[PDB]
């Protein structure tokens, strides 16, 4: 729908940017207010860094994925400078939140609860035939009530058949990416499953880098031998075994997100 009929377009006058939340080569993210009273996050495009069409594509996809466990699209301003306005998550990225005084104090029970919330959002993404491709603790946002939501849908894609193939020179974070994706550029919801297992290690170590003390080549070498990440310190064996399921060799042997959600809720409502 053209902007003049688009229920999501808002005049830029409705927004007041107050504090920078994040910055990058492609733009910034600011906390601001919509119509004076409503707190929101505003993602601005750094003019020239990337195509505006590319930037806006993420908003168009978010329109198709509305769910409580996914950061919600609020509005867009499609005239330059362009903005994607979204739901504000007070405690920022989970990977950062877990290192704060509040985060450090969380019990394993609350961490299990948070993992279950994340699996619940991915189960929605899964059932709608989408994939995220950048599932890591940096991309999980935390609300003021310590509820988690999936964010950053830049790489997210609608899966027509069963797989999306990235193009030749596409590069991805080796430590979080599934081997078939590193090797063949092939992504499916099972690749996200692999990433979730890695994400679980980030939750339990309060934000530590996965595969401690290893470089990317060492990670690849170890994986190809049949090894997986060494048990993190103070990681409940039940959770470690759930991670191992996420890291099954064959994509088809990895569980669904709805299965992971169900198990993590049992773990939580046990601890």
From Swiss-Prot:
E.C. number: 2.7.10.2
Effect seen on changing residue 164 to F: Abolishes autophosphorylation
Catalytic activity: L-tyrosyl-[protein] + ATP = O-phospho-L-tyrosyl-[protein] + ADP + H(+)
Principal location: membrane
Effect of residue 123 to V: Found in leukemia
Subcellular location, record wording: Cell membrane; Cytoplasm, Cytosol
Outcome after substituting residue 217 to L: Found in leukemia
UniProt membrane topology term: Lipid-anchor
Key word Cell membrane present: yes
GO molecular function: ATP binding; ATPase binding; CD4 receptor binding; CD8 receptor binding; identical protein binding; non-membrane spanning protein tyrosine kinase activity; phosphatidylinositol 3-kinase binding; phospholipase activator activity
Residues carrying Phosphotyrosine: 164
Glycyl lysine isopeptide (Lys-Gly) (interchain with G-Cter in ubiquitin) cross-link, chain position(s): 46
Post-translational modification: Autophosphorylated on Tyr-164, increasing enzymatic activity, this site is dephosphorylated by PTN22. Dephosphorylated by PTPRC/CD45. Dephosphorylation at Tyr-164 by PTPN2 negatively regulates T-cell receptor signaling. Dephosphorylation at Tyr-164 by DUSP22 negatively regulates T-cell receptor signaling. Myristoylation is required prior to palmitoylation.
Protein activity control: The relative activities of the inhibitory tyrosine-protein kinase CSK and the activating tyrosine-protein phosphatase PTPRC/CD45 determine the level of LCK activity. These interactions allow rapid and efficient activation of LCK in response to TCR stimulation.
Domain remark in the UniProt entry: The SH2 domain mediates interaction with SQSTM1.
Complex and partners: Binds to the cytoplasmic domain of cell surface receptors, such as AXL, CD2, CD4, CD5, CD8, CD44, CD45 and CD122. Also binds to effector molecules, such as PI4K, VAV1, RASA1, FYB1 and to other protein kinases including CDK1, RAF1, ZAP70 and SYK. Binds to phosphatidylinositol 3'-kinase (PI3K) from T-lymphocytes through its SH3 domain and to the tyrosine phosphorylated form of KHDRBS1/p70 through its SH2 domain. This interaction inhibits its tyrosine-kinase activity. Interacts with SQSTM1. Interacts with phosphorylated LIME1. Interacts with CBLB and PTPRH. Interacts with RUNX3.
Protein name: Tyrosine-protein kinase Lck
Part of the whole protein covered: 231 to 501 of 509
């Amino acid at each position: 729908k053209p902007w003049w009929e688009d229920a999501w377009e808002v005049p830029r006058e409705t927004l007041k940017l107050v504090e920078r939340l994040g910055a990058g080569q492609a733009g910034e993210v600011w906390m601001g207010y919509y119509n004076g009273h409503t707190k929101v996050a505003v993602k601005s495009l750094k003019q020239g860094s990337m195509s505006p069409d590319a930037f806006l594509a993420e908003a168009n996809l978010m329109k198709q994925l509305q769910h409580q466990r996914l950061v919600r699209l609020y509005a867009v301003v499609t005239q330059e400078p362009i903005y994607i306005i979204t739901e504000y998550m007070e405690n920022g990225s989970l990977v950062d939140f877990l290192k704060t005084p509040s985060g450090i104090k969380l019990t394993i029970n609350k961490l299990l609860d948070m993992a279950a919330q994340i699996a619940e959002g991915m189960a929605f993404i899964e059932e709608r035939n989408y994939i995220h491709r950048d599932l890591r603790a940096a991309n999980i946002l935390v609300s003021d009530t310590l509820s988690c939501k999936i964010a950053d849908f830049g790489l997210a894609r609608l899966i027509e058949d069963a797989e999306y193939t990235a193009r030749e020179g596409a590069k991805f974070p080796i430590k979080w990416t599934a081997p078939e994706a590193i090797n063949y550029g092939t992504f499916t919801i099972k690749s996200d499953v692999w990433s979730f297992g890695i994400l679980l290690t980030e939750i339990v170590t309060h934000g530590r880098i996965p595969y401690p003390g290893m470089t990317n080549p060492e990670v690849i070498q170890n994986l190809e031998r049949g090894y997986r990440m060494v048990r993190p310190d103070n990681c409940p064996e039940e959770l470690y075994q759930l991670m191992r399921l996420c890291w099954k060799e064959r994509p088809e042997d990895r569980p669904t997100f709805d299965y992971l959600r169900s198990v993590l809720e049992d773990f939580f409502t046990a601890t």
